[PDB]
Design a protein around this nucleic acid. Structure first.
Lengths: 59, 122, 95, 62, 98, 146, 159
RNA sequence: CGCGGCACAUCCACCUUGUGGUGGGUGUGGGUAGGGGAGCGUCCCUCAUUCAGCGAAGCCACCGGGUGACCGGUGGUGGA
RNA sequence: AUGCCGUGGUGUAAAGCGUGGCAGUGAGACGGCGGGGGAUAAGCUCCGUACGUCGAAAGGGAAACAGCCCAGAUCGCCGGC
RNA sequence: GAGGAGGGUGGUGAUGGCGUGCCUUUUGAAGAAUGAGCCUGCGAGUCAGGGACAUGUCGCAAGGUUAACCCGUGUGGGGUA
């Protein structure tokens, strides 16, 4: 139902797919937790950027 | 209209060489050297504004650590106590009450002790 | 009067004096290299050495008739919208 | 003082009824024997110049 | 004396002491109340957070001075890049009456 | 702003460290902290607070036996060759106070205040120090907490 | 007008052979970096008036006169004279009473009676003719004092 | 992240619902070659007004100011 | 496996495409992986890599340090993580 | 106003940490690469053309516009090739 994602690492050495994935997740700066809804493509993204984000499922 | 570009230039010249007084060498004296040094001085002062934020923090940390170890507690556990107790003081004022009030600081240390869990497990 | 005269805001554009300090357009003024362009200007004809598009294509076919009887046309529908009544017109009346 | 039209490129280029410059698609002049008819109805006509040859051609036409 | 908390920083002031605090929204005269982190009576210090949300330092905004002219002149190297800009941090003076 | 370092503001106490059985690294670190004055909260890297430190019984200060015969103290004289290698073994049966003082001076910072500070450390081999004019209070070493 | 190199006197000698001196390769004592040497990109005797259109010029003029009539600052008059002998006494009287302003235009015409011969020497008062009437001068001038012959022939030529 | 102060871009509620401005939300503000935009200062001509032998420019010193180019004040020098 | 092409859905701010003005650039370096030539070599040379960084990027770590790791500086703070 | 306590600018600055000049050119310079001993004055993107292109602004409008020239003295009025 929910995920509360937060960048925890920058996107300098991050390849293109990872950086566009953090755009399309909606992550701007580091401690920047966005919330992502129903998880079919959102879990795809949250696989493509694992080292960069942290997920602790919000309510 | 031949302009005689003196005045226009002497403006910034006098600028640099009044903001360059007190330089050992050909630097308060001459203009181009005062300019080379102005560029270096202002990058130095820029870097030192940030640097001094960080450096005063490291100094305050040394002081809080000294007063802590005067109270038999280390700085690490002191901070972990003042966190778990929650007294939202910061290293600056913590160091000030460290200097002037050994009494208030020792109250703070007992606060921190009373807010340490049990052990090195958690 | 003359102390109350200004152009339209949009004209009277600031001239770009280039070699005026590295804050606006600085040293190289726009030709930012040591190349050929940095001292002079390569023409529009020269293409590197390979035949330019004006030497490898063929001259356009046919001649130009020296005696080309060029006319001037007037539009019959727009000769209507020139003369709504009309009745009498003629080349002099058109001009 | 009075701009010269580049001759050689006004004798090879043609401004049409509107802003189009039409070159002549004519590697179709010397050897037309091996060349199939296909490759000549491919090379018989007047082709609107592409973009990557326009900004210069017009300054050749002026 | 109390460690007033203002402007994202914290200050240590007893009664009647001037403080160069951030650009508080205010004028001269009308007072203003500022939270504390730790208020002390020598041996009676206050530490428990809910005991501090009650203790409110209060003082009269006055003066609304400016900081000093912080001259920035960024300049990297052969790069050939200067960027000179300055800064007067807006401030205010404060007295402490609690 | 601080209130700790000013004119005539710092206090001068004394300390006697009996280098009885202690190891050289802990001893020198302890004396160095006392000497700079970090044991003090009224601290600053510009000023010289800190206490005159005396190190007594430095004759018998513990070093690994396998180091009294291996670890060498080179000191070059500028002249070609002239590298004056010397182990801490002969250096100990000659000047143990020089060994200890060397370790301490090595743990201080590298500046001019380092000189003004190290002029405060006395070290002696026998138990008998001459600076009893003061009340040199024994400071012994104690790991703290955590 | 200033002498760019090639107009500067002399300096067609390359002093100091290229290499072996220790100096800078110079090429001419009249190089722009020298003293007395040429000017570069210097002022030459330009002759610059823009070639504006007839409609724009005339329309600007009649806009300025429209302003003057819109305030009520046009002062058409019959003759600015005492009648035949050019006298500036009465003519100053009649202008500085006819105007009350500081700057005045006076469109008299190619007749001297006391118009374009007597009201001169009056600062603020410039004299024109019904056809060399222009924009800068009607704007510079506060009042626009006509002479009925000037006004009527002006109207009649503009239609 | 906090707290203040500038700037830019998109967006709405607006004033005159495109010009130009009020409020806000969001994003943004390293930078070379280079591109755009906005600007400081020198001098000359006009219009307006204004200061000047009670002291113009120039110069020097101090005290201020602007986000930058730079600006003003004050005194000393000077003498248009 | 990847990558590539398409379509379908969700997300995302200027990202895209068309057409003009104005440029620059066309000596690249190292580093990761994949390969060539080298000798199972080079701080070598030449390629690939919606790989990175320097170029053109400062700050922290690397003793010192263009290319390594953390991180992309709008200014201020004697504040925090 | 004295020896002064609080305080404020101004010399200087014991002492600590940070820190590899400017330029040009370079993959890369503090560079043991170039150039500069210093100060003051001068030194580099201009202008001409009823030029070519694109654009901002302004006349007039299926038009716009005059060139040489003629009248006049403010650059004003004619001049339809």
């Amino acid at each position: 139902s929910q995920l509360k994602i937060t960048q925890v690492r920058s996107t300098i050495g991050a390849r293109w797919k990872q950086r566009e994935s953090l755009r399309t997740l909606g992550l701007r700066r580091i401690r920047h937790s966005v919330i992502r809804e129903d998880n079919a493509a959102t879990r795809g993204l949250i696989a493509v950027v694992r080292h960069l984000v942290e997920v602790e499922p919000a309510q | 209209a031949r302009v005689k570009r003196a005045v226009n230039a002497h403006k910034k010249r006098r600028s640099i060489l009044k903001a360059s007084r007190g330089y050992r060498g050909q630097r308060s004296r001459l203009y181009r050297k005062a300019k080379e040094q102005q560029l270096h001085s202002l990058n130095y002062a820029y870097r030192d504004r940030r640097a001094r934020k960080g450096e005063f923090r490291k100094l305050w940390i040394a002081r809080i650590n000294a007063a802590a170890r005067l109270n038999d507690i280390t700085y690490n556990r002191l901070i972990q106590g003042l966190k778990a107790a929650g007294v939202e003081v910061d290293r600056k004022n913590l160091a000030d009450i460290a200097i002037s009030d050994p009494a208030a600081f020792t109250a703070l240390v007992d606060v921190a002790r009373a807010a340490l869990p049990e052990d090195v497990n958690a | 009067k003359l102390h109350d005269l200004r152009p339209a805001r949009g004209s009277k554009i600031a001239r770009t004096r280039v070699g005026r300090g590295d804050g606006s357009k600085g040293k190289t003024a726009g030709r930012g290299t040591k190349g050929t362009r940095a001292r002079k200007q390569v023409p529009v004809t020269f293409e590197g050495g390979q035949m330019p598009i004006h030497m490898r294509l063929p001259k356009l076919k046919g001649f130009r008739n020296r005696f080309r009887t060029e006319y001037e046309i007037v539009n019959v529908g727009d000769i209507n919208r020139l003369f709504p009544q009309g009745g009498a017109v003629g080349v002099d009346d058109l001009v | 003082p009075k701009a010269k039209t580049h001759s050689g490129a006004s004798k090879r280029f043609r401004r049409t009824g509107t802003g189009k410059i039409v070159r002549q698609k004519a590697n179709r002049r010397h050897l037309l024997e091996h060349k199939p008819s296909t490759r000549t109805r491919r090379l018989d006509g007047r082709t609107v110049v592409a973009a990557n040859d326009t900004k210069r051609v017009t300054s050749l036409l002026n | 004396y109390a460690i007033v908390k203002t402007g994202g920083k914290q200050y240590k002031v007893a009664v009647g002491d001037v403080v160069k605090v951030e650009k508080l929204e205010s004028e001269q005269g009308e007072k203003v109340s500022l939270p504390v982190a730790l208020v002390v009576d020598g041996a009676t210090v206050t530490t428990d957070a809910k005991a501090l949300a009650k203790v409110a330092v209060t003082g009269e905004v006055l003066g609304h001075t400016k900081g000093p002219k912080i001259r920035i002149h960024k300049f990297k190297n052969k790069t050939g890049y200067h960027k000179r800009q300055g800064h007067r941090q807006q401030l205010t003076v404060l007295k402490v009456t609690g | 702003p601080t209130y700790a370092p000013k004119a005539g503001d710092t206090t001068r106490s004394w300390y006697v460290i009996d280098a009885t059985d202690v190891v050289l690294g802990r001893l020198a670190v302890a004396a160095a902290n006392l000497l700079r004055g970090k044991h003090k909260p009224t601290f600053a890297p510009n000023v010289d607070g800190g206490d005159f430190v005396i190190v007594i019984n430095a004759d018998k200060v513990a070093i690994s036996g396998d180091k009294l015969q291996h670890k060498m103290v080179y000191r070059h004289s500028g002249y070609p060759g002239g590298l004056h290698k010397r182990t801490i073994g002969e250096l100990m049966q000659r000047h143990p106070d020089r060994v200890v003082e060397k370790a301490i001076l090595g743990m201080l910072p590298k500046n001019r205040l380092s000189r003004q500070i190290q002029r405060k450390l006395r070290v002696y081999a026998g138990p008998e120090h001459p600076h009893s004019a003061q009340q040199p209070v024994p400071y012994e070493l104690k790991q703290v907490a955590q | 007008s200033t002498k760019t190199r090639g107009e500067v006197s002399g300096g067609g000698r390359k002093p100091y052979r290229q290499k072996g001196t220790g100096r800078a390769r110079q090429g001419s004592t009249r190089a722009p970096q020298f003293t007395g040497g040429g000017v570069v990109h210097g002022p030459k005797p330009r002759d610059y008036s823009q070639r504006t259109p007839k409609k724009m010029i005339a329309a600007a003029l009649r806009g300025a006169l429209s302003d003057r009539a819109r305030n009520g600052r046009i002062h058409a008059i019959t003759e600015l004279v005492e009648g035949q002998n050019p006298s500036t006494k009465s003519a100053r009287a009649f202008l500085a009473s006819l105007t009350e302003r500081k700057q005045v235009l006076v469109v008299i015409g190619r007749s001297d009676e006391a118009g374009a011969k007597s009201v001169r020497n009056l600062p603020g008062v410039h004299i024109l003719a019904p056809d060399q009437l222009n924009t800068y001068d009607v704007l510079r001038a506060d009042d626009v004092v006509f002479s009925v012959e000037a006004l009527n022939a002006y109207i009649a030529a503009n239609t």
